[PDB]
Design an enzyme around this catalytic site. Structure first.
Site, PDB file in Angstrom:
ATOM      1  N   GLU A  36       0.897  -1.151   0.000  1.00 34.44           N
ATOM      2  CA  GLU A  36       0.000   0.000   0.000  1.00 34.44           C
ATOM      3  C   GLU A  36       0.951   1.220   0.000  1.00 34.44           C
ATOM      4  OE1 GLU A  36      -2.026  -0.963   3.865  1.00 34.44           O
ATOM      5  OE2 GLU A  36      -3.844  -0.883   2.527  1.00 34.44           O
ATOM      6  N   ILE A  37       0.486   2.455   0.270  1.00 34.60           N
ATOM      7  CA  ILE A  37       1.384   3.608   0.281  1.00 34.60           C
ATOM      8  C   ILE A  37       2.161   3.688   1.578  1.00 34.60           C
ATOM      9  CG2 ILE A  37      -0.134   4.940  -1.222  1.00 34.60           C
ATOM     10  CD1 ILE A  37      -1.260   6.341   1.262  1.00 34.60           C
ATOM     11  N   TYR A  85       1.515   9.979   1.961  1.00 33.28           N
ATOM     12  CA  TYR A  85       0.970  10.672   0.798  1.00 33.28           C
ATOM     13  C   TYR A  85       2.043  11.348  -0.046  1.00 33.28           C
ATOM     14  CZ  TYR A  85      -3.811   9.619   2.306  1.00 33.28           C
ATOM     15  OH  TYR A  85      -4.977   8.944   2.598  1.00 33.28           O
ATOM     16  N   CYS A 123      -4.092  -1.354  -2.873  1.00 32.33           N
ATOM     17  CA  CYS A 123      -4.097   0.084  -3.169  1.00 32.33           C
ATOM     18  C   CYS A 123      -2.993   0.540  -4.137  1.00 32.33           C
ATOM     19  CB  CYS A 123      -3.759   0.691  -1.847  1.00 32.33           C
ATOM     20  SG  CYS A 123      -3.850   2.406  -1.457  1.00 32.33           S
ATOM     21  N   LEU A 124      -1.824   1.233  -3.822  1.00 33.82           N
ATOM     22  CA  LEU A 124      -0.876   1.576  -4.841  1.00 33.82           C
ATOM     23  C   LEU A 124      -0.557   0.193  -5.423  1.00 33.82           C
ATOM     24  CD1 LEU A 124       1.403   3.232  -6.050  1.00 33.82           C
ATOM     25  CD2 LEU A 124       2.686   2.856  -3.966  1.00 33.82           C
ATOM     26  N   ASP A 171     -16.002   3.478  -2.568  1.00 37.59           N
ATOM     27  CA  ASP A 171     -14.642   4.035  -2.476  1.00 37.59           C
ATOM     28  C   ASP A 171     -14.591   5.399  -3.164  1.00 37.59           C
ATOM     29  OD1 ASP A 171     -11.872   4.508  -2.889  1.00 37.59           O
ATOM     30  OD2 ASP A 171     -11.394   2.444  -3.338  1.00 37.59           O
ATOM     31  N   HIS A 202     -12.442   2.215   0.402  1.00 36.17           N
ATOM     32  CA  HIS A 202     -11.038   1.870   0.249  1.00 36.17           C
ATOM     33  C   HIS A 202     -10.493   1.179   1.504  1.00 36.17           C
ATOM     34  CE1 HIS A 202      -7.900   2.723  -2.524  1.00 36.17           C
ATOM     35  NE2 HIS A 202      -7.129   2.990  -1.487  1.00 36.17           N
TER      36      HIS A 202
END
EC number: 3.1.1.45
Length: 233
Positions: A36-37, A85, A123-124, A171, A202
């Site tokens: 994920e991020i 972020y 996610c990413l 989402d 999400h």
């Protein structure tokens, strides 16, 4: 949050580490997990654990190593989220796919490997899953809530190996129109499977998120396992 001494060399010479979980019984198929991020953090370790408990080997590469090796952020800390972020904003998707191809090759040749490799991304990592799927580097790919899929529709016809995507119907990254384009677009290639979880947004599969939906995560997780099973020797 990384396995000491593992070092994987990418296409341009860049090297990165990874968290690796060897299988209970070898050889086994290897799952590469796309982060994920937040980096290779708690949820990644828990994913690694889970898959090993299910009979796979798993490798989770440090995708942020090109910007800051070894980052592992806690999504519950405001300051750490801000940092996540910022790193996401500057991430190079192309280089990220190249790094994943390097981890996939690495996976294919470990002593405990059965030669089959799947990829699971969140996610990413779910957006990366689609891109790696269009490149054809893995036997099967799974993406959970990838961002921006609506912008990669032109690659649909390029996918030649099965890929499954789990998407939340609430989402905010995927408003109604985007949902329609993905549905219709992915609908044209039978190697692509997309499932919508109506009342989930999400991060619905991560226990620590306020977006956690136990029922949606459970069904998406079982479909993931069923889908990866064929890779089992």
């Amino acid at each position: 949050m990384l396995t000491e001494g593992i070092s994987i060399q990418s296409y341009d010479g860049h090297t990165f580490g990874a968290l690796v979980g060897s299988p209970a019984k070898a050889p086994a198929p290897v799952i590469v997990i796309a982060q994920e991020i937040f980096g290779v953090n708690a949820f990644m370790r828990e994913t690694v654990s889970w898959l090993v408990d299910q009979g796979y080997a798993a490798v989770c590469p440090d995708l942020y190593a090109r910007q800051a090796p070894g980052t592992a952020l806690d999504p519950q800390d405001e300051r750490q989220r801000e940092q996540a972020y910022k790193l996401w904003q500057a991430f190079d998707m192309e280089a990220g796919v190249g790094d994943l191809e390097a981890a996939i090759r690495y996976a294919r040749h470990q002593p405990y490997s059965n030669g089959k490799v799947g990829l699971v991304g969140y996610c990413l990592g779910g957006a990366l899953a689609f891109l790696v799927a269009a490149k054809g580097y893995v036997d099967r790919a799974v993406g959970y809530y990838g961002v921006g899929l609506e912008k990669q529709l032109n690659k649909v016809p390029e996918v030649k190996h099965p890929a499954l995507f789990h998407m939340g119907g609430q989402d905010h990254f995927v408003p109604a129109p985007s949902r329609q384009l993905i549905t219709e677009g992915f609908g044209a290639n039978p190697l692509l499977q997309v499932h919508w979880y109506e009342e989930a947004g999400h991060s619905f599969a991560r226990t620590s998120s306020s977006g956690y939906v136990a029922s949606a995560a459970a069904l998406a997780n079982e479909r993931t396992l069923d889908f990866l099973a064929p890779l089992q020797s």
